[PDB]
């Protein structure tokens, strides 16, 4: 493995910050959680901090998740 892999042997806290503009509809999302790569496991909670998300949440999973 690589040197970098050593950073992932335990639970690692995660922060996600997104700024978006879809057809002029602007929004931001903040997420928090943790990852445990030993088990391939991610747990995250996202909040649209600007109000209503103007697109469906599932369409953002590959970007935010």
């Amino acid at each position: 493995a690589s040197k970098g892999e050593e950073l992932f042997t335990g639970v690692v806290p995660i922060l996600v910050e997104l700024d978006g503009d879809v057809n002029g509809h602007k929004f931001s999302v903040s997420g928090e959680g943790e990852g445990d790569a030993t088990y391939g496991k991610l747990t995250l909670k996202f909040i649209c901090t600007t109000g209503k998300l103007p697109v469906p949440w599932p369409t953002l999973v590959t970007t935010l998740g």
Binding site: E5, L18, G20, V22, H25, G40, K41, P56, T59, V61
Partner: protein
């Protein structure tokens, strides 16, 4: 699929894990997500450590969406089908590319395809791992926090690398 450094690479595949190899300095991840018969997202993100915390910062730009399409019209079910992410090396950029299809469920029973094309390149100068072809098998569960009044998403994901024996 924003923090693919949390994938589980089996020990016999660990020489193929670009994502962790780029840490802590991190990598740039770019995608084009093309929604069939609708618009597209273009995303640019930087994934890196800030102290002991793994940070994913993203800019997303969506254009050419249909006002009462499945996306702007909120016609997609709140769930998520398992899928694979197919990774190949991009030696010329000292990074990787990926291709995969996401199939969102439409509330009428149909499917909304989202084609994904992805490119990742290291931010730092240190050596990285350029993989042989392989894939990430992903499963995601979407839920809600019953005490949260803000618009939100709770996600539980498992991802394992595969395709090399």
């Amino acid at each position: 699929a924003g923090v693919q450094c949390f994938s589980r690479y089996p020990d016999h595949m660990k020489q193929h894990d670009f994502f962790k190899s780029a840490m802590p300095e991190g990598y740039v991840q770019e995608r084009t997500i093309s929604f069939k018969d609708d618009g597209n997202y273009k995303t640019r993100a930087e994934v890196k450590f800030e102290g002991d915390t793994l940070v994913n910062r993203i800019e997303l730009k969506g254009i050419d969406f249909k006002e009462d399409g499945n996306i702007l019209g909120h016609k997609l079910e709140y769930n998520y089908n398992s899928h694979n992410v197919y990774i190949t090396a991009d030696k010329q950029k000292n990074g990787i590319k990926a291709n995969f299809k996401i199939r969102h469920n439409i509330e009428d029973g149909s499917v909304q395809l989202a084609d994904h094309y992805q490119q990742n390149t290291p931010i730092g100068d240190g050596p990285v791992l350029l993989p042989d072809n392989h894939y990430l098998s992903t499963q995601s569960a979407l839920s809600k926090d019953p005490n949260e009044k803000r618009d939100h998403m709770v996600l539980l994901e498992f991802v394992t690398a595969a395709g090399i024996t």
